[PDB]
């Protein structure tokens, strides 16, 4: 195996190009960079700009006003002697129930969310087409789902190894000033760098892609590294992480789940996502 | 915001005093000290006395006889080369299925439990009244619930940051001989000391208060710190932690849950506590 | 209490010998070594031989071909700059859906699995008989279940303290060249060594034995230690861990569960294993 993380143009895939390369990428790697999907650096920088201003310059009171009463990191702001936000701050959003610091932030972030949600649906549609997969209930009902967007600022592991439990996850990063590459994934049994690319988004396949396709798609393990010390000046970083997550009522075959590695304890022949994961979303999982 | 942790007299709240102060405390802080609730230092010391004697002087055989066959810390004693109890010992009780080292311990601990359970119900009734909340099924059925009391001796973080998943949690501590203040909570985005007060109990609102009230009550994050070394002589401590926990069949609105931050994966319009958390109680949660 | 970990011959127990000793062992310890159960060192070495050859000498491509697309450690190979397998490698199997590196490996490992599954059922039948226990639905339907076998190579804690959630767990180890004893369990409130025995398998009772027997069987806590440094040359080791796990539909009394320490949040009077643990198997649990 070439252990190179590939790149695909969404526009080209949608035109039927690179069918074998894409399908083998999904089976053997389960991650790739995606160009030509409507996600520019320019917009990343505009959404990034307005939230970073809020993180640095918003007051305790303004933060409070967009903090959920339970600290779940589902919507709004999460700071996370001193503060939980010493380590990192988060801003989360979905298709509704959002908490916005102002009308300007709302306009920018709604647009950014919608662009990520469209791209995510679109790449997912290609993963399903590439694998000949018709979800129970059909493709469009499956993709009209329960996305979660989290943007996270890290001051100068960071994140332990895990796989995602999404259909797909779209990641936009900003680079470390000092060049350190924090995001890593297992490819060919070894940890491969996943650097910022100004022209592309990183796609990880998650365990729901494995499930829905009957095991035709790998859900790779990945983690976020921390610098040496030679590299701990200018080591701060941000990431925009978009989880395309199924509806609670997403239904699948139990015997099929078993065949691809899922250690289910489910009686009978079909089950729902809620049956499997329970009554709260679980976005990530460790192999341990 | 004043980030002072307030104190309320339960007797005064029950007479309708400090309505605005209490309601704003619940919304903006979700914790407070409570006086005038039937919980003296004297009784803490009497229950504390008899269990500490058991911890230090009870034999392996006497410990065994009040240890559950599965090490869940639900009832009885939990020790928790050498032993799991090197780090800490626990004594747990509920409204039934209790394991008591003797008739004297049973009398003292039953009375102590009942006083904490009454106070917990009583403060919870005030939180519900303050927020205009009628639980599905009514107030009294909601409060006749599944409490758990755990008393824990810590030898000289200790507890990672979390919020509780109770309606309310009542905490009585004994101080460190050397003055160190181990319990901390986020208030105004910063870690505030929560010291022993001889005349008062500390109340944390938990995520069930947030849920049942439709988001009118904050569930604060809190953690237990460890000394410096200048403060690691005389750093042992004890805490009595009373979780007022809903019945499995406690029913709530799914859309309402979503509106206040709960990242539910629940199909349809109502759900039960068992639907949400699953078939075992989960007492605490991290934001991570 | 004698805190010696006892040994029983399965053949003798099946003939009705040592009834009191066995029953008191289950109640007070919940672990023992088992001889005369069809599990030789010779076979351990033959299954061990062929998998260790695969771990050291199988290629990336051959590993890939027996790796599940989701990294669950349910079937096949789990490696677990550099690799997740730097720390340890795993090989997992069940009664079906297995992934085998070759016809020779398959023959050897199928036979090894079957021998462990037979021994596990057989010792479990004795635990149930010793405690006068008839599972809902009868003994044989209960024991025709969902086993999982994991073989794990550890290079030179390792495993945090936990109890198992199996009916029983059978452990075959190979020793450290340097004599260090990694596996430890709580017996008499203290950590007792559990060394390799060439003629015997180690049996841990799990929480399902506690549950099904109404609390007549202890589920002990255990952990895997790491050497000093004087003992970190020749500290690598392997273990074969067989979990005899109930069917999803295993049914028990909720009030009875409560009586023995299980902190269930289950409405009504009976429940299933799936109700209690959820839709994925959970093999181990910490007291924390
Ligand atoms: C590696 C990842 C793709 S998944 C991981 C992590 N996951 C989350 O925050 C997610 N659990 C979350 C969303 C909303 C509320 C609570 C929590 C995240 O972000 N990391 C991404 C990254 O580092 O690139
Ligand atoms: C911060 C807290 C209010 S909640 C936290 C912790 N929680 C538990 O022990 C509880 N999970 C438990 C009860 C019974 C059986 C198993 C476990 C506890 O005690 N700490 C309190 C404290 O330190 O003041
Ligand atoms: C102490 C133990 C008896 S249980 C513990 C651990 N558990 C597992 O690997 C098990 N969770 C597993 C099986 C399959 C897929 C995912 C995970 C294991 O192995 N250790 C044994 C040991 O060290 O002797
Ligand atoms: Fe991830
Ligand atoms: Fe707590
Ligand atoms: Fe174990």
- Residue-wise DSSP of A103-126: HHHHHHHHHHHHHHHHHHHHHHHH
Which residues have a beta carbon within 5 Å of ligand 5, which is an ion?
B 164
Please name which of C259, C246, C227, C276 lies closest in space to residue C139, comparing C-alpha atoms.
C246
Resolution stated for this PDB structure, in Å: 1.5
Residue C80, ligand 3, Cβ within 6 A = no
A73: left (phi over 0), alpha (psi -120 to 50) or beta: left
Closest CA to C218 of C21, C24, C13: C24
- Minimal-distance CA residue to ligand 3 atom 11: C283
Q: Which of C23, C74, C150, C197 is catalytic?
A: C74
| Record: contact C261-B80, CB cut-off 8 A | no
Instruction: Establish if B234 touches chain A: CB-CB under 8 angstroms.
Output: no
C-alpha distance from B52 to closest chain A C-alpha (Å): 31
Name B220's Cβ contacts closer than 8 Å, sequence gap at least 6. Answer: B29, B30, B31, B163, B185, B186, B187, B204, B205
From the CA of A205, how far away is ligand 4's center (Å)?
Answer: 10
CATH number of C1-288: 2.60.120.330
Question: How remote is the CA of residue A242 from the centroid of ligand 1, in Å?
Answer: 8
Of A75, C137, A72, which Cα lies nearest the Cα of B219? A72
**Nearest CB to A279 within list B163, B189, B266:** B266
Find the catalytic residue in A24, A27, A74, A125: A74
Q: Which residues contact C140 (CB under 8 A, 6 or more apart)?
A: none
Query: What's the Cα-to-Cα distance from C85 to each of A162, A225, C82, C174, rounded to whole Å?
Result: 14, 17, 8, 19
Closest in A186, A190, A262 to C70, CB measured: A262
The number of angstroms, rounded, from the C-alpha of C48 to the middle of its chain's C-alpha atoms is 16
**B27·A69 Cβ contact <8 A:** yes
| Count of positions (residues) in chain C | 288
Give A161 Cα–ligand 4 centroid separation in angstroms.
8
The three-state secondary structure class of A83 is: coil
Structure tokens given for A263: 């250690």
Window A:157-216, CB contacts with B under 8 Å: none
Measure CA A168 to chain center: 6
Nearest CA to ligand 1 atom 19: A241
Question: CA-CA distance, C117 to C124, in Å (whole number)?
Answer: 10
Q: Which helix (H) or strand (E) holds B32?
A: strand B31-35
Q: How many residues does chain A have?
A: 288
Q: Does C126 contact B at CB distance below 8 Å? A: no
Chain A contact present for C118, CB below 8 A: no
Say if residues B210 and B218 touch (Cβ distance below 8 Å). yes
Round to whole Å and give the CA distance between B112 and B149. Answer: 10
A264 vs C contacts (CB less than 8 Å): 248, 279-281
Quick one: which ligand is closest to C225's CA? Answer: 3
């Amino acid at each position: 195996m070439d252990t190179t993380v590939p790149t695909f143009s969404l526009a080209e895939l949608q035109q039927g190009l690179h069918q074998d390369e894409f399908r083998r990428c999904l089976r053997d790697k389960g991650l790739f960079y995606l160009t030509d999907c409507g996600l520019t650096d320019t917009e990343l920088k505009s959404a990034k700009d307005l939230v970073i201003d809020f993180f640095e310059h918003g007051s305790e009171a303004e933060k409070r006003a967009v903090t959920s009463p339970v600290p779940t990191m589902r919507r709004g702001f999460t700071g996370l002697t001193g503060s939980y936000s010493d380590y990192s701050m988060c801003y989360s959003m979905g298709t509704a129930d959002n908490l916005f610091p102002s009308g300007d932030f709302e306009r920018i972030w709604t647009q950014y969310f919608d662009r990520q949600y469209t791209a995510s649906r679109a790449v997912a549609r290609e993963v399903l087409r590439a694998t000949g997969t018709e979800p129970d209930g059909g493709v469009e009902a499956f993709l009209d789902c329960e996305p979660l967007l989290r943007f996270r600022y890290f001051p100068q592991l960071r994140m332990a190894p895990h796989y995602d439990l999404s259909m797909v996850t779209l990641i936009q990063q900003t680079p470390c000033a000092n060049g350190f590459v924090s995001l890593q994934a297992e490819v060919g049994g070894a940890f491969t760098d996943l650097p910022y690319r100004p022209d592309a988004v990183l796609v990880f396949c998650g365990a729901i892609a494995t499930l829905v396709t009957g095991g035709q798609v790998k859900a790779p393990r990945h983690h976020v590294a921390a610098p040496r010390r030679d590299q701990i000046a200018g080591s701060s970083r941000t990431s925009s992480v978009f989880f395309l997550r199924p509806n609670a009522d997403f239904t699948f075959s139990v015997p099929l789940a078993r065949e691809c590695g899922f250690d289910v304890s489910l009686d009978g022949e079909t089950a729902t996502f809620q049956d499997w994961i329970g009554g709260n979303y679980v976005n990530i999982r460790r192999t341990s």
